[PDB]
Design a protein around this ligand. Structure first.
Ligand SMILES: OC[C@H]1O[C@H](O[C@@H]2[C@H](O)[C@@H](O)[C@H](O[C@H]3[C@H](O)[C@@H](O)[C@H](O)O[C@@H]3CO)O[C@@H]2CO)[C@H](O)[C@@H](O)[C@H]1O
Ligand SMILES: OC[C@H]1O[C@H](O[C@@H]2[C@H](O)[C@@H](O)[C@H](O[C@H]3[C@H](O)[C@@H](O)[C@H](O)O[C@@H]3CO)O[C@@H]2CO)[C@H](O)[C@@H](O)[C@H]1O
Ligand SMILES: OC[C@H]1O[C@H](O[C@@H]2[C@H](O)[C@@H](O)[C@H](O[C@H]3[C@H](O)[C@@H](O)[C@H](O)O[C@@H]3CO)O[C@@H]2CO)[C@H](O)[C@@H](O)[C@H]1O
Ligand SMILES: OC[C@H]1O[C@H](O[C@@H]2[C@H](O)[C@@H](O)[C@H](O[C@H]3[C@H](O)[C@@H](O)[C@H](O)O[C@@H]3CO)O[C@@H]2CO)[C@H](O)[C@@H](O)[C@H]1O
Ligand SMILES: OC[C@H]1O[C@H](O[C@@H]2[C@H](O)[C@@H](O)[C@H](O[C@H]3[C@H](O)[C@@H](O)[C@H](O)O[C@@H]3CO)O[C@@H]2CO)[C@H](O)[C@@H](O)[C@H]1O
Ligand SMILES: OC[C@H]1O[C@H](O[C@@H]2[C@H](O)[C@@H](O)[C@H](O)O[C@@H]2CO)[C@H](O)[C@@H](O)[C@H]1O
Lengths: 69, 69, 69, 69, 69
């Protein structure tokens, strides 16, 4: 799956349908994988660089793949 | 959904019916989403600014949407 | 529900029936709410003041309500 | 249940059958309680003293009771 | 089960099929055990040494056993 954005997590958002949004770089993206919610908030709190990989690389696009560095 | 309050979490409370209350700004609000309990206590501990979005923007009102910054 | 004890958590204990005991002030109290285990150990680690509310305010009494400050 | 060992946790191990081993003092002990995995790793990271109570107080013995201080 | 690699976690990756990859030493390995995701990210954040044990000790090999030190 191609790299879409790499950077520090700017903010996260819990959504009404239980999906989770993250803003990294210039994109707001969401995931429906519940296991990623605490992992991404941890990455946000500790200032980790993340790379999100998705073919839906546009604002509001979905993803499931993330690299934590 | 409109912004209701933005600020640091002043306290949280676990309730007898397993919902979770947070006090942000001048409002006490609750959520029935279990996944948000550890996320909100983490935001409280680390001093994150949160924005809660809800149409029930009054003391005792419910919410599911939260932005963590 | 009335306030029973307020203070820093002295110790916590996982029990054989999967309930969780906490010692705050002069009371040892337990809860059967699984969601509260990680929250209470976080409060213990970070030195938060907690208030436990319960009508069974005696050693070995049960509770479900907790305020984290 | 009697005290078996007290001390800082030296290491933990996730096992192939999803049980979790801890080494405290001179004993390696395991638990089948999933809820204890994150609690014990937190105790390890923060240097907490733990007391494990079990009647199977020997290397490879099972436990469910733990006091976190 | 034999030791395969020991070292600090270089990066972790959440995968599209909900497995989790870790790079330790010269190997990229994955696990299908959901409970290990938060444990491994905690080990990564805090700089813990981990040892992964697996008979599939090659890039892309699976594991379930991990020692955290
Ligand atoms: O978390 C939501 C969702 O994330 C992942 O899917 C993403 C989009 O939601 C999904 O529409 C997108 O599908 C692609 C196909 O991968 C591609 O082969 C096809 O040509 O175009 C569609 C539309 O762009 O894929 C992205 C991730 O690449 C995840 O796969 C999915 O299960 C779900 O978790
Ligand atoms: O966590 C509890 C609850 O939070 C969210 O719902 C909130 C209130 O509980 C709910 O009564 C409120 O209803 C709104 C309608 O959505 C809106 O269309 C109408 O105009 O006004 C009523 C009353 O304010 O909605 C808020 C959220 O804005 C969440 O949606 C719900 O599922 C549940 O989690
Ligand atoms: O986690 C265990 C338990 O905690 C909460 O209940 C507590 C006691 O376990 C319960 O026996 C006690 O019951 C009270 C009633 O609240 C009171 O109205 C009646 O007059 O006397 C009885 C006996 O003391 O209540 C406390 C909490 O105040 C929690 O409510 C319960 O669901 C369970 O989680
Ligand atoms: O996590 C595994 C297991 O831990 C607890 O049980 C422990 C041993 O696994 C179990 O074999 C042992 O049994 C005791 C009897 O309870 C006792 O009555 C008899 O005298 O001796 C045997 C052998 O030592 O008990 C220990 C705990 O003391 C936990 O109870 C069990 O449910 C399970 O979680
Ligand atoms: O998380 C994925 C997976 O990890 C563990 O299995 C690993 C490989 O996925 C599995 O193919 C491998 O099988 C071994 C046999 O157990 C062994 O008897 C034989 O000699 O070699 C094969 C191939 O290496 O085992 C490793 C772990 O050593 C875990 O056991 C499995 O349930 C699953 O979680
Ligand atoms: O305590 C060390 C070992 O724990 C686990 O095995 C225990 C127990 O020791 C053993 O006798 C029993 O057959 O299985 C238990 C787990 O269900 C691990 O599986 C071992 O690798 C040791 O770490």
């Amino acid at each position: 799956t191609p790299d879409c954005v790499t950077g520090k997590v700017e903010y996260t958002k819990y959504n009404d349908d239980d999906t989770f949004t993250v803003k990294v770089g210039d994109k707001e993206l969401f995931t429906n994988r519940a296991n990623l919610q605490s992992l991404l908030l941890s990455a946000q709190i500790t200032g980790m660089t993340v790379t999100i990989k998705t073919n839906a690389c546009h604002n509001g696009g979905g993803f499931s793949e993330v690299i934590f560095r």
